[PDB]
Amino acid sequence: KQVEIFTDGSCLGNPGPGGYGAILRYRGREKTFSAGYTRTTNNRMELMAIIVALEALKEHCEVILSTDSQYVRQGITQWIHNWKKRGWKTADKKPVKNVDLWQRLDAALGQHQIKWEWVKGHAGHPENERCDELARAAAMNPTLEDTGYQVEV
C-alpha cells in the first residue's frame, strides 16, 4: 500500500560480469538495493533486480513497479501464462530459459497488487537512471556468484 519500485540490470557481456539496482520508495522514504555477479547475463540481472526488491516487502502491498526491460515485459505480459500451462518447458520440452529466476519472481508477484510501469528511456525517469548507475557500478565490482546461470547451448 503504496510502494513504488524502480529497477534495472546491467552486464558487460553474455555472459559476463553484471549487477542490478533497485529503489524501493514508501512514505517518501527510499531504500536502495544493489549487487554485482561475476558471471551472469543482462536478462538475469533485470529479473534479479525485481526479485530482490519485491522480496524486501514484508507485508502485502500495492506496488507500482517501474522497469525498462523488454525481456521482463514480454515474460510478464506474454509468455509466463503459457509457460505455466506447459509446465515451464518450451515446445522442445527443454526447461524455459531462466526458469529459476522466473519462478522465484512469480512467487513474489503473487503476494502483491502490482501495476507495471513499462518505462521507455532514461529521459524523465530519474529513479531508473539511478538504478542503471547502481547496476553498472556493481557490475564493475562483482562479489556474488549467479549460481543459477547456465551456459545456454
Among the options 21, 68, 125, 146, which is catalytic?
68
Told to judge if 146 belongs to the known catalytic residues of this protein, a careful annotator would answer no
8 is in an annotated binding site: yes
Told to judge if 100 belongs to the known catalytic residues of this protein, a careful annotator would answer no
Among the options 4, 117, 122, 148, which is catalytic?
122
Told to judge if 132 belongs to the known catalytic residues of this protein, a careful annotator would answer yes
Told to judge if 19 belongs to the known catalytic residues of this protein, a careful annotator would answer no
Among the options 19, 21, 36, 46, which is catalytic?
46
Told to judge if 68 belongs to the known catalytic residues of this protein, a careful annotator would answer yes
92 is in an annotated binding site: no
Q: Are 45 and 85 in contact (CB under 8 A)?
A: no
Say how many CA atoms lie within 13 Å of 116 toward its Cβ. Answer: 14
What residues are labeled active site? 8-9, 46, 68, 122, 132
Q: Which residues are annotated as a binding site for Mg(2+)?
A: 8, 46, 68, 132
